[PDB]
């Protein structure tokens, strides 16, 4: 299904699992990437991907964009490179679908999405000064798989 | 003491807003009233803010307006110095205008209609879709700004 | 204590001095409470009324100020308790108080107890208090006959400080006689 059906925040917050059943599992494989044993403060450079518009990103896009991002980091910095990326958002919003015309229209559960306000950090990678151009590229690939336009903003990095 | 002037019509105006304007003795566009600056009166003009033009006028401007647009509680009668002298507690328009600004009395209290029925602004106003800070003619005004409007609506 | 959600009892409940549930049923009468309280050595009786910032004691009496009328005996017994109530009841009559309900606090409604003795004393002083005669001790025990007969099993004096050998419930009679007398500086 198209994201056009679930990208906007036009419905109430629907997360209460004690009242919702049959919610599909999350396709998001990982939230902690790179070296999850090392700390974020142990890195000179901290780059984050910032969403420019308030939206809802389905776990399908979340996985795909996170995948196309980290896969690049693995390709350029190796499977054990000195970096660590983070997906700080979790798909809490349960999505329906009315799949009988408009009669008894309350739809059945089809998936989950993460609500992100404009200006928020969806991703945040921590790397060294050298690998800074690879993380920017991974994020460039990442924002190509999510509904909104994004900014690749450097939080810690006067090395330019 | 502030001078209120309705610049926006009644149609589509909220009833509670329209009712306030009527409580402030103003029932038509371009009608003006002199309101004391009290807590009670302040709440009222704040509610009317978007459909009105207000501010404290200069003694001079107030005198010009009173002379030209003030009226008795009943009748055509011109409110000139002689009129003021014979019916009010003052000696002339200036004496009246001073007490009004100093909030010592009211138009009604002196046998005058609470409303100053002004003429449309000569040369036109700054627009009723924007406030003063945005180049419009709505809301609170500078003493110089209010004078420009009132004098323009001589 | 633990957190924001924590509920701390009312002060007089933490202190375990006021049974609020009983207090309500008590106040429902509208009449003043005849607060009957005890101590290891003494016995007190207050006539309390309700007030805007707290209770109002209109007339009280303590076993300590009992000796002020000729009492050379101890102060934690039946004759003592009764007389204290009678004294309090009399001071109450003086203040305009005409009726009351027995408030015994955290004490037990045991038949023939001192709190009931206090009650009988106040009632005798002329106060109208809802009571039950067969829950009050028998007249003689109020006089302190149970203690005289205890001293009968002598061999060793019951009383340390010499008040007397075989004790005197007759003293009770003497004091009651004194209080019921119209004169007396209350």
């Amino acid at each position: 299904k198209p994201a056009s059906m679930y990208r906007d925040i036009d419905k109430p917050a629907y997360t209460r699992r004690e009242y919702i059943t049959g919610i599909p599992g999350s396709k998001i494989a990982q939230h902690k990437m790179g070296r999850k044993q090392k700390d974020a403060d142990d890195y000179p450079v901290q780059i984050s991907l910032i969403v420019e518009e308030t939206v809802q990103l389905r776990h399908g896009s979340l996985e795909a964009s996170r995948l196309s991002a980290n896969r690049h980091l693995i390709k350029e910095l190796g499977e054990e490179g000195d970096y660590k990326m983070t997906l700080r958002k979790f798909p809490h919003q349960v999505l329906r679908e009315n799949k009988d015309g408009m009669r008894a229209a309350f739809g059945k559960i089809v998936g989950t999405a993460a609500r992100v306000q404009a200006g928020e950090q969806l991703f945040t990678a921590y790397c060294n000064v050298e690998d800074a151009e690879h993380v920017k590229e991974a994020f460039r690939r990442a924002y190509n798989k999510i509904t909104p336009s994004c900014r690749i903003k450097v939080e810690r990095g006067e090395e330019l | 003491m502030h001078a209120l002037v309705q610049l926006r019509g009644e149609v589509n105006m909220h009833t509670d807003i329209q009712d306030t304007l009527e409580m402030l003795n103003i029932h038509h566009v371009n009608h003006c009233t002199l309101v004391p600056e009290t807590d009670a009166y302040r709440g009222m003009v704040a509610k009317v803010n978007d459909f009105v033009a207000f501010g404290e006028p200069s003694q001079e401007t107030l005198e010009t307006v009173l002379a030209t647009r003030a009226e008795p509680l009943e009748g055509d009668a011109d409110v000139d110095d002689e009129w003021v002298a014979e019916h009010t507690d003052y000696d002339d328009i200036s004496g009246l205008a001073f007490a009004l600004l100093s909030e010592e009395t009211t138009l009604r209290e002196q046998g005058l209609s609470p409303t100053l029925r002004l003429h449309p602004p000569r040369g036109g106003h700054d627009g009723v879709k924007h406030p003063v800070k945005e180049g419009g003619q709505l809301g609170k005004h500078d003493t110089e700004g209010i004078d420009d409007l009132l004098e323009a609506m001589r | 204590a633990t957190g924001p959600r924590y509920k701390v009892p009312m002060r007089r409940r933490r202190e375990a001095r006021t049974d609020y549930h009983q207090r309500l049923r008590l106040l429902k009468s509208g009449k003043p409470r005849l607060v009957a309280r005890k101590s290891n050595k003494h016995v007190r009786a207050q006539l309390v009324t309700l007030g805007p910032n707290g209770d109002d004691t209109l007339a009280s009496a303590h076993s300590s100020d009992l000796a002020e009328y000729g009492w050379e005996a101890p102060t934690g017994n039946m004759p003592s308790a009764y007389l204290t109530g009678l004294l309090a009841g009399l001071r109450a009559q003086e203040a305009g108080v005409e009726e009351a309900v027995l408030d015994i606090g955290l004490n037990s409604p045991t038949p023939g107890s001192k709190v009931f003795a206090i009650q009988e004393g106040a009632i005798d002083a002329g106060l109208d208090i809802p009571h039950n005669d067969d829950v009050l001790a028998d007249w003689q025990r109020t006089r302190g006959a149970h203690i005289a007969e205890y001293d009968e099993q002598l061999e060793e004096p019951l009383y340390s400080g010499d008040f007397d050998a075989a004790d005197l419930p007759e003293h009770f009679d003497e004091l009651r006689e004194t209080l019921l007398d119209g004169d007396i500086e209350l």
């Binding site: - | - | 001095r17 955290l106 004490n107």
Partner: protein
């Protein structure tokens, strides 16, 4: 200071947790006073469907009855270090429990203005062993 701080025997509870009686007879003879039945709550698969029903019995001994029992009860036991409660109590065994405490315990057992005994006035395992050991027997 030491007087209103030296321990004493609060109570000695001799109990027999059977599970279904005839046992009351022996306790009455060994202790001296009358015993009391013991009920239970919650249904158990070990044939305990009847909630309120006799399962055991107990006897709370106080004063002489307590000591006169301990004189001929303690020798029958081999007191250990771990067998002591944090509040300065100990249970050995037919269970025989001894509740030990300082001179002003009534403060927490009375109705009027009751209060909980402060940690400092609460008896210690060590202070308990000592008091007991200092009366016809050995510790550890």
């Amino acid at each position: 200071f030491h007087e209103m701080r030296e321990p004493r025997i609060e109570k000695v509870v001799v109990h027999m947790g059977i599970g279904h009686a005839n046992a009351e007879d022996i306790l009455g003879e060994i202790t001296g006073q009358m015993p009391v039945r013991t009920k239970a709550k919650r249904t158990v698969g070990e044939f305990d469907i009847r909630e309120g029903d006799p399962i055991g019995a107990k006897v709370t001994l106080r004063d002489e009855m307590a000591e006169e029992f301990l004189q001929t009860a303690l020798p029958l036991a081999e007191l250990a270090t771990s067998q002591f409660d944090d509040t300065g109590n100990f249970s050995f065994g037919l269970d025989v429990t001894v509740n030990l405490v300082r001179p002003g315990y009534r403060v927490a057992k009375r109705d009027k203005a009751s209060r909980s005994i402060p940690t400092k006035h609460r008896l210690n395992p060590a202070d308990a062993v000592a008091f007991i050991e200092s009366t016809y027997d050995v510790e550890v």
